[PDB]
A paper describes a structure:
The highly acidic environment (pH 1) in the stomach is generated by the gastric proton pump, H+,K+-ATPase, which mediates an exchange of H+ and K+ across the parietal cell membrane that is coupled with ATP hydrolysis. The H+,K+-ATPase consists of two subunits. The β-subunit is a single-span membrane protein with a short N-terminal cytoplasmic tail and a large C-terminal ectodomain, and it is involved in correct membrane integration and targeting of the complex to the cell surface.
Better-resolving crystals were obtained by using a Tyr799Trp mutation on the α-subunit (Y799W). We therefore conclude that Tyr799Trp prefers the luminal-closed K+-occluded state, (K+)E2-P, and is thus suitable for the structural analysis of the K+-occluded form. Similar results were obtained for Rb+ coordination in the Y799W(Rb+)E2-MgFx (valence 1.14) and Y799W(Rb+)E2-AlFx (valence 1.07) structures, but these results are clearly different from those previously reported for the Rb+-bound (SCH)E2BeFx structure (valence 0.39). The observed K+-independent ATPase activity of Tyr799Trp in the absence of K+ indicates that the luminal gate of this mutant is spontaneously closed, like those of the previously reported constitutively active mutants.
Author numbering:
A (entry chain A): 47 to 1033
B (entry chain B): 29 to 290
Write the structure that this text describes.
């Protein structure tokens, strides 16, 4: 049903199947019935869920939901305490509001990660014609294309796009552009003749988006709407399931860890609180406070800030991301599936090789001409160059003198454009030179003569001869020659020269290149006077016994920076696969040229030819390289595709369909690969969507390709992929640094509540000041770890195992929580007891002191000296407690950020001051702390107190202890890599 | 195996127990040195006691402050007020006051040696006698029965705080909004002028003066109208007492609602 088989049906069979007439069309009535049966001939737009539902689910998620529940508990508390007329507990309203702001701001961060929010079927329906000409009841007229139905009889002419998928009945000189299917814009002939098994390859099927470049044809509408081949390409592009990026996986993972541990601590201490005498409402408030303390309210925000600071860096290299997650993925990539035409190559036919003087020469095919040229001293060469210059009909359009020769626009077919650019580049000015030798006679290329010819006055004032120049298919050019230019002389063409020619010609064929022969003849004045009347239809000139000059061959060459980029990715442990719709021989030649196939790699057919032994008997694992075509691939089983991918590290998939590209990508994925896809064409969009990351070419890319992509290369510099690999590996290694620093301080946020509950000391740390730490004083330091340089030689490392190397694993967690976080909590408590005692409250009096502390009916409570304190006085002293715990945590966070600068190296080698953003971050942290402490008013707005310098210093021994402890740990892992000390205390 | 091998679990566990004992010990030693730095007689800092709080007896709280309401006819409505007054005064008996001495200096009682028993400084007696009409005798209803009740105004003690020696610090009670209906609140204070004798100062702390008792002053409210809600403010007048704090209504003054139902 989906599959077109109508290319294999007689006209009788098609007329019966569709109920139509191959000359007069469908009846109007039956066309209307069919239109009501199948709907418009149009692509159905699959709309993604509304713009607000995106934001709604950005407001859920584990941390988000814990914050929700916490704000709900604050609102219930604020309601209950306002209902009994208690005005002091407005903190719960301020707290629920802050939490709600954090939820909403976090969800904004998660929503504005996706910049574009565009649809792909918009760009697909821009490839669709609006009108068609149809024959119904023998009346030919023009309708809207969406009114066409399966069975209609339709006319196409050169210039217009094909209105549906069509089985062709009549055609005159008709040629189409099938780049939306193959990525190749080479014109294809359409006839009514069935020339292939595949409807994708036969000449008598034409497709819906495609342009008819020339000629005229008539045919039966065989598929419409999403059933057309462009409709199915668009279905695959649009309808691929929302799969999460590697870093979303990592983020969701640590969110699950943290939400679980939060629910654990809240629930167990709520149980404990009720066991220990508190009332339900009070234990519920403890659960809210423990969730606020333990959860990192600022974390998701810091992560998307780090992702942004990497997106900025990439963007400065003309590498534009469409969503912050795509900033990581290339760093975790293990297989790259790459389009060839216009992705690895320039999509521009270029002169590549030359046969003359019995040797094959190589031309410089780079777009900058940054490469290796060939030898131009020969006089055979001067003659061949004269021939290929004078026998061209193309021309540069005017005023391009500033444009580089490869970019310049030429009026001519592909080959003549290539020859013209090669002329302009090799000798001075192709058109000026050309005008110096005036054409007196010419026949353009026919399918009858099978060559192109022109006869020319010479430039020399003295020389009165006429030079004839001719080009065409090599064997055809040869069978009209009798001599050949070899090393400054003209030899008769004996059998050995014909053999050498044929060998060279088939060699250049084997490199996937198109070959042209070029010949000459000088016509004397004694037979052709200076004004001889050269008339084409008379053929008064010879056209035989010509002098052969050389072969010139051409290919779509690699973009200059592509081959080194590919070896670089391979050095980073990334596999590179070619996935092209082009023909296999060209595919393999470009694969070899660009480094996808290494010097010395052999396919199974390669080995078979080397040993003159059948393919049957070649041992499959002896072949490092492999070239599978789309037909072969259609024939394989999934297991067979897997065994191929496992058996041959250097893999080329040629002549593949859009769906087949997606199938290769997903086969890699199912084997555990994180896959990137680099392309430029409509035929790449399905593989682009399905890839863990899709990179489109910015200049050469078609709109479907760019829309489906997650990254765009604005200057088409494939080397940018290598930049991306490095930044992704960097941002991952630095995010784990950033995150470890942010989680650490959650434990000394938590423990003061756990002690306050179970020990009933006056409350050491309030929820407002926790938020101030989480959302303000520690944020810039954690972000500054983004700018940390690489510790090791990251671009000679293998891609990370996605299943074993995670952003946050239990070593990082347990170290950050239950070692360093614990040291910080001990600091906080040491400072708390110091400030209490120095203000009159000995440690043992604090145990159980909480109820009298928090009693508004108790204005003369006695302290360890007997001094009498009001509730107000005690409350300010509580705020002093908050502040001294806050400063202990800040001071410890200075050491924290310093030791998170390096997971392996010592800070004595890299130094403390190399990262200057981090130093600015520390200074900003301390400044905003001083502001909070010593700006007047702060005691009655945010509960911060001008603490004494002693309590700034009290926690500093603990901070230094953190530095030293981590410094020694990392020494240990360096000196003892096999050790227990490595295997357990590395993170 | 359960996450790890059992041997690896034991080794990790002992490392964390070691880590935590070492850290707990470092902490304990911090607290120990802290308590050797701390002097047992004078606190290191008095950052939150720049001005003394003031409290009242009998302290009955409505919501958002002291609220006191009783009926002159039903003696059961003031029974508890007189009872907590009696029970507060229990520690100001001449027996309870045996640990203190008779001061007459009418001047700051500065002592820098410990001449009192068990290495102590002397502290001045304050006996309920000194409250006269508001002492529980001869009127054991503390003025409530007659609708002219006694409220006892105590000042929070602070180590080495001196209130000012040009005179004694006094109490002054008055109305918050002096009612256009009526005259100013008329008070008789015991002792006379509602003063705290200077020799009750400075306080040297619970270890130096274990038998210290805060001097009191009873305000006998004579003017209060019946069946009307009034608000009474009592401030301490001294050179070094402030009562302007908006975040502490009990700093240097005490306010309370009063209603004497008839
Ligand atoms: C995961 C497992 C975690 C395990 C956590 C364990 C935490 C426990 C660690 C230590 C326990 C307390 C150590 C106290 C050592 C006392 C040393 C000492 O001899 O000092 C004397 C004081 C008594 O004063 P004095 O009568 O002599 O004063 C008179 C003043 N003069 C001397 C001038 C006359 O002894 C005293 O205070 C006795 C009362 C001590 C105060 C109890 C305070 C309770 C607070 C606990 C919070 C701990 C948080 C830990 C955070 C862990 C993070 C994971
Ligand atoms: C299923 C999950 C695990 C659950 C663990 C439960 C652990 C054991 C729980 C309880 C056992 C102890 C029970 C004590 C006897 C009942 C106490 C009681 O009836 O109440 C009395 C007071 C609280 O009332 P009040 O006298 O102040 O009120 C008076 C009102 N007024 C102020 C006006 C006078 O009790 C006090 O304050 C003094 C008592 C202090 C005892 C602290 C014990 C520490 C408790 C738990 C820590 C264990 C955590 C384990 C974490 C494992 C996680 C994996
Ligand atoms: C996730 C990683 C974080 C790890 C943190 C987890 C936290 C879980 C810890 C749980 C430990 C709970 C310990 C419970 C202790 C209760 C002590 C107690 O209820 O004891 C009573 C006396 C206090 O004096 P009092 O009752 O006469 O004052 C009352 C004056 N009134 C009667 C006029 C009101 O305690 C004494 O004498 C001396 C008793 C010494 C208490 C030291 C407590 C330090 C313990 C652990 C830290
Ligand atoms: C592995 C190697 C790294 C660790 C070794 C380095 C730490 C020792 C080195 C230097 C310590 C002092 C550094 C300067 C900062 C002072 C911290 C502090 O002064 O802390 C002392 C607190 C009690 O403060 P305070 O009343 O003496 O203040 C005095 C206020 N004034 C003098 C103005 C009246 O008690 C305490 O932390 C505990 C004091 C006893 C010493 C144990 C330190 C444990 C820390 C770890
Ligand atoms: C590996 C390294 C690990 C080690 C970590 C080292 C971290 C170093 C960070 C640098 C810290 C800088 O510290 C600056 C601290 O400034 C404290 C200022 O102290 C002033 C003390 O004042 C006492 C407060 O008195 C309160 C009463 O004020 C009355 C007078 O007010 C006048 C106006 O002042 C306003 C409040 O002071
Ligand atoms: C110090 C005393 C009171 C607490 C002793 C409780 C024990 C059972 C606790 C305290 C610290 C805990 C460990 C903290 C760190 C880690 C490493 C992590 O990758 C797995 C969990 C694990 C291994 C925890 C297991 C349980 C643990 C060992
Ligand atoms: C300490 O002195 C007090 C005086 O306040 C006395 O009552 C007590 O008996 C003495 N205690 C001892 C142990 O001598
Ligand atoms: C206090 O007692 C004396 C003696 O009874 C009396 O004269 C005086 O009026 C009393 N004061 C008040 C306010 O009743
Ligand atoms: C008040 O105290 C001061 C202390 O500064 C003292 O010198 C002075 O003599 C005292 N004056 C009176 C009148 O008590
Ligand atoms: C305080 O008492 C004295 C007598 O010692 C008297 O002169 C003065 O007027 C009294 N002040 C007030 C306000 O009653
Ligand atoms: C005071 O008590 C009497 C007698 O019990 C009662 O009649 C009167 O209403 C009470 N006062 C008020 C204000 O209710
Ligand atoms: Mg392409
Ligand atoms: Rb937190
Ligand atoms: Rb062209
Ligand atoms: Rb000429
Ligand atoms: Rb393209
Ligand atoms: Rb994708
Ligand atoms: Rb995908």
């Amino acid at each position: 049903g989906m599959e077109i088989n109508d290319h294999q049906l007689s006209v009788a069979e098609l007329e019966q199947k569709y109920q139509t007439s191959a000359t007069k069309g469908l009846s109007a009535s039956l066309a209307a019935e069919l239109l009501l049966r199948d709907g418009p001939n149009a692509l159905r737009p699959p709309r993604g869920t509304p713009e607000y539902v995106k934001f709604a689910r950005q407001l859920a998620g584990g941390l988000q939901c814990l914050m929700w529940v916490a704000a709900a508990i604050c609102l219930i508390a604020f309601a209950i305490q306002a209902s009994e007329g208690d005005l002091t507990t407005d903190d719960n309203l301020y707290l629920a509001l802050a939490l709600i702001a954090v939820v909403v701001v976090t969800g904004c961060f998660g929503y504005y990660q996706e910049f574009k929010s565009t649809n792909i079927i918009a760009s697909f329906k821009n490839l669709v014609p609006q009108q068609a000409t149809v024959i119904r009841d023998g009346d030919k007229f023009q309708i809207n294309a969406d009114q066409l139905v399966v069975g209609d009889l339709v006319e196409m002419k050169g210039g217009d796009r094909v209105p549906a998928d069509i089985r062709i009945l009549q055609a005159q000189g008709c040629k189409v552009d099938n780049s939306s299917l193959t990525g190749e814009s080479e014109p294809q002939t359409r006839s009514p003749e069935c020339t292939h098994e595949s409807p994708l390859e036969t000449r008598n099927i034409a497709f819906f988006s495609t342009m008819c470049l020339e000629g005229t044809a008539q045919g039966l509408v065989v598929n419409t709407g999403d059933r057309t081949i462009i409709g199915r390409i668009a279905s695959l592009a649009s309808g691929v399931e929302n799969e999460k990026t590697p870093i979303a996986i990592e983020i969701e993972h640590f969110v699950d860890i943290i939400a679980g541990l939060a629910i654990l601590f809240g629930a167990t201490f709520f149980i404990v609180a009720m066991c220990i005498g508190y009332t339900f409402l009070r234990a519920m408030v403890f659960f809210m406070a423990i969730v606020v303390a333990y959860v990192p309210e600022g974390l998701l925000a810091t992560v998307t800030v780090c992702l942004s600071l990497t997106a900025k860096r990439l963007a400065s290299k003309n590498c534009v991301v469409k969503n912050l997650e795509a900033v990581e993925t290339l760093g975790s990539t293990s297989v790259i599936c790459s389009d060839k035409t216009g992705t690895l190559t320039q999509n521009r036919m270029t002169v590549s090789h030359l046969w003359f003087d019995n040797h094959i020469h190589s031309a410089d095919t780079t777009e900058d001409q940054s490469g290796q040229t060939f030898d131009q001293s020969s006089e055979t060469w001067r003659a061949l160059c004269r021939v290929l210059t004078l026998c061209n009909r193309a021309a540069f359009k005017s005023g391009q003198d500033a444009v580089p020769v490869p970019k310049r626009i030429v009026i001519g077919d592909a080959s003549e454009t290539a020859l013209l650019k090669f002329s302009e580049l090799t000798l001075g000015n192709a058109m000026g030179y050309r005008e110096r030798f005036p054409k007196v006679c010419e026949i353009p290329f026919n399918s009858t003569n099978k060559f192109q010819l022109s006869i020319h006055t010479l430039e020399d004032p003295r020389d009165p001869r006429h030079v004839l120049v001719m080009k065409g298919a090599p064997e055809r050019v040869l069978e009209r020659c009798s001599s050949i230019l070899i090393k400054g002389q003209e030899l008769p063409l004996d059998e050995q020269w014909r053999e050498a020619f044929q060998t060279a010609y088939l060699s250049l064929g084997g490199l996937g290149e198109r070959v042209l022969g070029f010949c000459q003849l000088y016509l004397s004045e004694k037979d052709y006077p200076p004004g001889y009347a050269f008339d084409v239809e008379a053929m008064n000139f010879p056209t035989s016994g010509l002098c052969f000059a050389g072969l010139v061959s051409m290919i779509d060459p690699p973009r200059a920076t592509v081959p080194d980029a590919v070896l670089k990715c391979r050095t980073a442990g990334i596999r590179v696969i070619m996935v092209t719709g082009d023909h296999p021989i060209t595919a393999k030649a470009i694969a070899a040229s660009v480094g996808i196939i290494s010097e010395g790699s052999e396919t199974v057919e390669d080995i078979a030819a080397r040993l003159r032994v059948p393919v049957d008997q070649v041992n499959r694992k002896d072949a490092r390289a492999c070239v599978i075509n789309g037909m072969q691939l259609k024939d394989m089983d999934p297991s067979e595709l897997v065994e191929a991918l496992r058996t041959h590290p250097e893999m080329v998939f040629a002549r593949t369909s859009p769906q087949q590209k997606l199938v290769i990508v997903e086969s890699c994925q199912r084997l555990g690969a994180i896959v990137a896809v680099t392309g430029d064409g409509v035929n790449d969009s399905p593989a682009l969507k399905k890839a863990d990351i899709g990179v489109a070419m910015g200049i050469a890319g078609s709109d479907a390709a760019k829309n489906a992509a997650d990254m765009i290369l604005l200057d088409d510099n494939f080397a940018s992929i290598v930049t991306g690999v490095e930044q992704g590996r960097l941002i991952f290694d630095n995010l784990k640094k950033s995150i470890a620093y942010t989680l650490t301080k959650n434990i000394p946020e938590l423990t003061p509540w756990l002690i306050y509950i179970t020990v009933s000391v006056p409350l050491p740390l309030g929820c407002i000041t926790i938020l101030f730490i989480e959302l303000c004083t520690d944020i810039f330091p954690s972000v500054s770890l983004a700018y940390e340089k690489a510790e090791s030689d990251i671009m000679h490392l293998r891609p990370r195992n996605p299943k074993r190397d995670r952003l946050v694993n239990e070593p990082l967690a347990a170290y950050s929580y239950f070692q360093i976080g614990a040291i910080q909590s001990f600091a906080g408590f040491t400072d708390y007891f110091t400030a209490m005692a120095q203000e009159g409250w000995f440690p043992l009096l604090c145990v159980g002191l909480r109820p009298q502390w928090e009693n508004h009916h108790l204005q003369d409570l006695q302290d360890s000296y007997g001094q009498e304190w009001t509730f107000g006085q005690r409350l300010y002293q509580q705020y002093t407690c908050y502040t001294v715990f806050f400063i202990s945590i800040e001071m410890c966070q200075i050491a924290d950020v310093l030791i998170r600068k390096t997971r392996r190296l010592s800070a004595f080698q890299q130094g403390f001051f190399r990262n200057r953003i981090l130093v600015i971050a520390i200074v900003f942290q301390v400044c905003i702390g001083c502001f909070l402490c010593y700006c007047p008013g702060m005691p009655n707005i945010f509960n911060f107190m001008p603490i004494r310098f002693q309590w700034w210093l009290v926690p500093m021994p603990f901070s230094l202890l953190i530095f030293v402890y981590d410094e020694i740990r990392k020494l240990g892992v360096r000196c003892c890599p096999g050790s227990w000390w490595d295997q357990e205390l590395y993170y | 195996m359960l996450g790890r091998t059992l041997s690896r679990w034991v080794w990790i566990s002992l490392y964390y127990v070691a880590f935590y004992v070492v850290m707990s010990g470092i902490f304990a030693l911090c607290i120990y040195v802290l308590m050797r730095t701390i002097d047992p007689y004078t606190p290191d800092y008095q950052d939150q006691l720049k001005s003394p709080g003031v409290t009242l007896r009998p302290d009955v709280y409505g919501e958002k402050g002291l609220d006191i309401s009783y009926n002159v006819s039903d003696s059961t409505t003031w029974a508890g007020l007189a009872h907590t007054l009696h029970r507060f005064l229990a520690g100001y008996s001449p027996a309870a006051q045996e640990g203190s001495i008779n001061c007459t200096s009418e001047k700051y009682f500065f002592q820098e040696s410990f001449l009192a028993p068990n290495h102590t400084k002397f502290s001045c007696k304050f006996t309920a006698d000194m409250l006269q009409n508001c002492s529980g005798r001869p009127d054991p209803t503390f003025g409530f029965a007659e609708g002219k009740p006694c409220f006892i105004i105590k000042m929070n003690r602070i180590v080495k705080f001196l209130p000012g020696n040009s005179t004694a610090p006094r109490v002054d009670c008055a109305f918050l909004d002096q009612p256009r209906d009526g005259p100013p609140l008329q008070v008789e204070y015991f002792p006379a002028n509602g003063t705290y004798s200077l020799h009750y100062f400075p306080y040297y702390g619970k270890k130096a003066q274990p038998h210290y008792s805060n001097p009191l002053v009873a305000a006998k409210l004579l003017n209060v109208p019946r069946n009307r809600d009034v608000v009474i403010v009592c401030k301490i007048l001294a050179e070094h007492v402030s009562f302007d704090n908006p975040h502490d209504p009990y700093e240097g003054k005490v306010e309370f609602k009063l209603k004497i139902q008839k």
